[PDB]
């Protein structure tokens, strides 16, 4: 499948799929306590890369919370918040037109 | 001090001298609107006075037993909750539209906002506006159920393992990293379906009480 | 489409603004002591009743229609309904 132009806003060139930045541990502090076994960094990266790698397969099309809580197990509210973080930073849904 | 009581009013024509199906959110801290004045405005359809009395006594009964969010009650304030996820089942009919759905919801994280979720649901599925209140009532009504069972079991809402073997068994299992991706068997039921439906199918459903 | 008719003592009302009469009569949205009750919420609840009723001047608009469509608790939509009724902004030409 021919890949199209990855396009995020410049204040987010810091995002890297294979690591967790500082801004993410401050914005989404529920996966970074060490007290909830179901919410760690390893699962954070899954939830987060699936949403991001999904939206990039076709960036002209809104990726949604429903298609994320269908595919991945975890608190839907936690996934609502992850979805909105990534929307703020334009890492999700930046081009939906 | 949020205490929206999820009210469910249901009275049949057989054992109740009248029929009525309704749901609402009653804010228990607002003591200044009379229940009786609200019910008499609800049912502009008519022994009227004695039927208002039995409805109010139902609303009152539910306000007087409502178990407000125990976390915002017995101080904890643990960010991100103790991972007590519930299964929130939806089966909502609004006119001809019926929504079936299932999603996990954490009952021990007081920053989960049902109205914020219900309102993006109705944006993404583009549901008719009426679904927003109904999805929110159903989140709050199913969450309360578990908040009121744990209560009558003396659970301390602090984070310990759930004693009761049943209540513990309805609680979703812990999410290791091999569990993040849903099996095909679960992603079937954990997703929304919006059917159109007729008066005739509606009859089949209601006749399933 | 419909030409809306309100009483002469309610020309202060503006869908895009809030007036002190409104702050006076429904203080529960402006005390900032509850997060789900804010001026933005007040305008959403309030305009949904005034604009919904203005599509059908001749039909009564009800508290039940209002709480089915808007996320507010029942008591506050009743009180909001009561007030818009008092000033002739819903249900004035039913």
Could you characterize the architecture of this molecule?
The complex is a heterotrimer, with two copies of chain A and one copy of chain B (209 residues). Chain A has helices at residues 22-27, 41-57, 65-71, 76-88. Chain A has 97 residues and is an all-alpha fold. Chain A has one domain. In chain A, helix 2 packs across helix 4 (76-88). Chain B folds into two domains: 4-65, no CATH class; 85-206, no CATH class. Helices cover 37% and strands 19% of the residues of chain B. In chain B, helix 1 crosses helix 2 (48-65) and helix 3 packs antiparallel against helix 4 (131-152). At the B-C interface, strand 2, helix 1, helix 3 and helix 4 of B face helix 3 and helix 4 of C.
Following the backbone from N to C, one meets helices and strands of chain A in this order, namely HHHH
Which strands sit side by side, in order, in the main sheet of chain B?
Answer: 3-4-5
Biggest sheet features of chain B: 3 strands, antiparallel
Total DSSP helices of chain B: 7
PDB class: gene regulation
Keywords: Complex, gene regulation
Assembly: trimeric
Entry title: Structure of yeast Snf5 and Swi3 subcomplex
Task: State the gist of this model.
The complex is a heterotrimer, with 2 copies of chain A and 1 copy of chain B (209 residues). Chain A has helices at residues 22-27, 41-57, 65-71, 76-88.
Describe how the helices and strands are arranged:
The complex is a heterotrimer, with two copies of chain A and one copy of chain B (209 residues).
Chain A lengths: L21 H6 L13 H17 L7 H7 L4 H13 L9
Chain B lengths: L3 E8 L8 E8 L7 H8 L5 H18 L19 E10 L2 E10 L7 H11 L6 H22 L12 H6 L15 H4 L3 E4 L2 H8 L3
Antiparallel strand pairs in B: 1-2, 3-4, 4-5
Organism (chain C): Saccharomyces cerevisiae (strain ATCC 204508 / S288c)
Protein name (chain C): SWI/SNF complex subunit SWI3
Subcellular location (chain C): Nucleus
